């Protein structure tokens, strides 16, 4: 199929597949990142999926059918005997409960594509409690409780990595290798085409939604900023970069643009320090993610300079592309075959994804969800969050309202309560303590 | 210095570090790549360059100077005792003698940034035979005696590669991350922004060579396509991919357009057959190195028009800079710490770098060398060569004409003879009865 010789990661699945002891994967959710994945698995070498988990049962036969053409390949379990006995007959064991598979003797990772925050909580820490492998799609999540489920996948000797291809991971790649080589990164971040608008509900995009059949959440989400402010945050707390200001500046820039513009003032761009998260709107950036080094020496300004790459002290890293969750088992691959992760948060976060209502609201009522109508993501350093007693973001669904809260304001402790009693409002209470 | 937390490789080689034993390179030649590598290397972690050597000792002195600002990090050795001494006080040593550094206890990988093939086959088969490893930057070396040298470091358990940083090196950091997914590599190379000038000789650029400070023969072989050919070459013998014809397309496309055009004809494009090295002439491809990549299932198909990587079946992966002698120290970084090369030839060659005339020659005259006068390389399938007798590019600097040869035509051993005694005729001989 590839028409090449087997090389680096290639050649090491290969060699996987060659022992007849495939890589297996146990999946949790079946929508669409979860589709994606078995259709992606269903073409490599050394990895599978052992088995698939959703809440309502046809959804798995749903998204393997839409892998394969047919349902021939899945087979129900009940039980544990079931399980192994349909992944030892090379089927993928479908059930409705996400137990038998972060329990599965044969299963050596985990990954969580529902896209459900207090899920991949729920299911993140126990996977890590069976001694599995946790791959992290749920960046929600992440920012919320990454890095204690990190410390706690070290105590059971286990990996915990956010899965390649979305964002976040995509620029962790840039940053590696601007820092290998001893550069300073200026700025790093993700692009957008057209301006974020703050104010967007499924009323206005409920048309588009139906239309593509996509979950209208995920457009909102899009639109208001939530989903950038959650991937910068991300990229944050793996690295000690920090938005310069709340919200970060989000200026008008071209790809050719970004090293004029998101680097200090006293240079002529717009931030008040160098070492930041950061998003731009305009031309050519996205589908990617960038870093902007500096230069120290003037002989690789020059060589950088004569190569064309741009016009010194700093200068633009592009990786043009990223392929959400068709990238994921090059995670799963490197987790397993190598020991490596992809990406974990520092054991300290530098930031925190906070919320800001989009809509007046008085005491009592609840607070939604992302995504909806009632509040948006906003990242802010941890310093200032805590002084302005900001909830973070991943807490806030299905919250109370006990305060008045207008548009455009934060969302604090004075003003709002999360559900005490969800998994992930228990989770990062621990986070805290442990931190404290 | 670099604003962000230590991972991966960049944590890997302060970790090295912190052992108190760098990673020592013997460096081979003080000129523009060498004194790129001395000031590359100095701002990095764990990797020091533990010798330096030069025909002429006092351009080691000078490459120095041009890193630091003053040659106190110098101390010059002529005997290993000497050698030994210096690396341990904490200089680059320096020395007129190869054989010196080839030979040093202290030193674990060599390069030889001379950029001449001749002494880069000698100092090449030298490092295997001491037992060190070798990363390669001559990349006229490699496609000539590449093989044999790979088989020779396999006998010795060193490890060979190419350097990073350079096209063949980059594009295949795209053809592992597309084959390790199971996707179709349809195309591969890299782009130029100006069309070639086969007809191009040193007097068309004595004028830029002297207001550049650079060697002319560095921008002859570049206009006239002979590093292009080289470089295709080097991607095709490492992977399986071919030319689709002798020479090469190299269409005109913008990077835009190199999904609708280095694709097969059927489809619109202009190759006979999917997997192929070729290069475009157009805007926006250079500096940087690309993969055409084929999807064969509908639903990634879909992933990647909504991610707006492309239209497909046919997507581009490109990366849009190469930092030359920059990221050499990343190979030896992998090579030392990891035991993986960046790159290697397969062990049965699949192109060859051939030569033709630029002018008219009549016997008894001599051939010159790349980026001059005489001749010129051009890229052909091995059968292909083989039929025509043709003479590896990399064997005829100073050869001698044996029958008259028009301009156009092809250098074969009918017409010409390499100068017999070359270490690189020599090591060539010994890979043709390898592979016999
Ligand atoms: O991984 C994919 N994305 O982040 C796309 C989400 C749209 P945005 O880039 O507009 O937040
Ligand atoms: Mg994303
Ligand atoms: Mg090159």
Same mark, same amino acid.
């Given at each position: 199929t590839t028409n090449v010789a087997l090389v680096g990661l290639a050649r090491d699945l290969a060699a996987r597949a060659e022992t007849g002891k495939p890589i297996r994967i146990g999946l949790i959710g079946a929508g669409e990142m979860g589709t994606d994945i078995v259709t992606q698995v269903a073409r490599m070498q050394g990895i599978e999926v052992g088995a698939l988990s959703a809440r309502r049962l046809p959804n798995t036969f749903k998204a393997i059918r839409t892998a394969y053409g047919d349902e021939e390949n899945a087979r129900e379990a009940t039980t544990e005997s079931a399980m192994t006995r349909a992944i030892e007959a090379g089927k993928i064991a479908v059930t409705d409960d996400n137990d038998l598979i972060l329990s599965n003797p044969l299963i050596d990772v985990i990954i969580d594509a529902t896209g459900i925050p207090e899920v991949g909580a729920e299911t993140g820490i126990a996977a890590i409690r069976n001694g599995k492998h946790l791959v992290m799609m749920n960046v929600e999540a992440d920012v919320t409780i990454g890095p204690y489920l990190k410390a706690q996948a070290d105590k059971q000797g286990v990996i915990y990595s956010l899965g390649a291809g979305d964002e976040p991971s995509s620029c962790m790649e840039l940053i590696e290798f601007v820092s290998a080589l001893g550069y300073e990164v200026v700025s790093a971040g993700k692009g957008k085409n057209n301006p974020l608008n703050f104010d967007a509900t499924p009323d206005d995009y409920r048309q588009e939604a139906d239309r593509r059949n996509m979950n209208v959440r995920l457009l909102v989400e899009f639109i208001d900023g939530s989903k950038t402010m959650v991937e910068m945050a991300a990229i944050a707390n793996a690295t000690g970069l920090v938005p310069d200001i709340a919200g970060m500046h989000g200026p008008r820039a071209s790809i050719d643009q970004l090293s004029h513009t998101l680097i200090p003032q006293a240079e002529g761009?717009?931030?008040? @320090?160098?070492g930041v998260v950061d998003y731009s709107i305009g031309k050519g950036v996205s589908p990617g993610v960038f870093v902007v080094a500096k230069m120290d020496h003037p002989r690789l300004n020059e060589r950088l300079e004569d190569l064309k790459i741009g016009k010194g002290p700093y200068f633009t890293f592009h990786r043009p592309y990223h392929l959400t969750s068709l990238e994921v088992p090059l995670t799963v691959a490197r987790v397993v075959l190598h020991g490596k992760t992809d990406m974990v948060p520092l054991? @300290?976060?530098?930031?925190e994804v906070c919320a800001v209502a989009k809509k007046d609201m008085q005491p009592g009522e609840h607070l939604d969800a992302i995504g909806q109508y009632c509040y948006r993501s906003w990242i802010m350093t941890v310093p200032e969050a805590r002084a302005a007693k900001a909830i973070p973001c991943g807490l806030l669904q299905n919250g109370t309202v006990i305060a008045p809260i207008k548009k455009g304001e934060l969302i604090t402790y004075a003003n709002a309560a999360p559900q005490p009693g969800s998994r992930i409002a228990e989770l990062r209470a621990l986070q805290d303590a442990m931190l404290g």
């Open positions: 761009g717009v931030l008040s @320090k160098s054991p @300290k976060p530098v930031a």
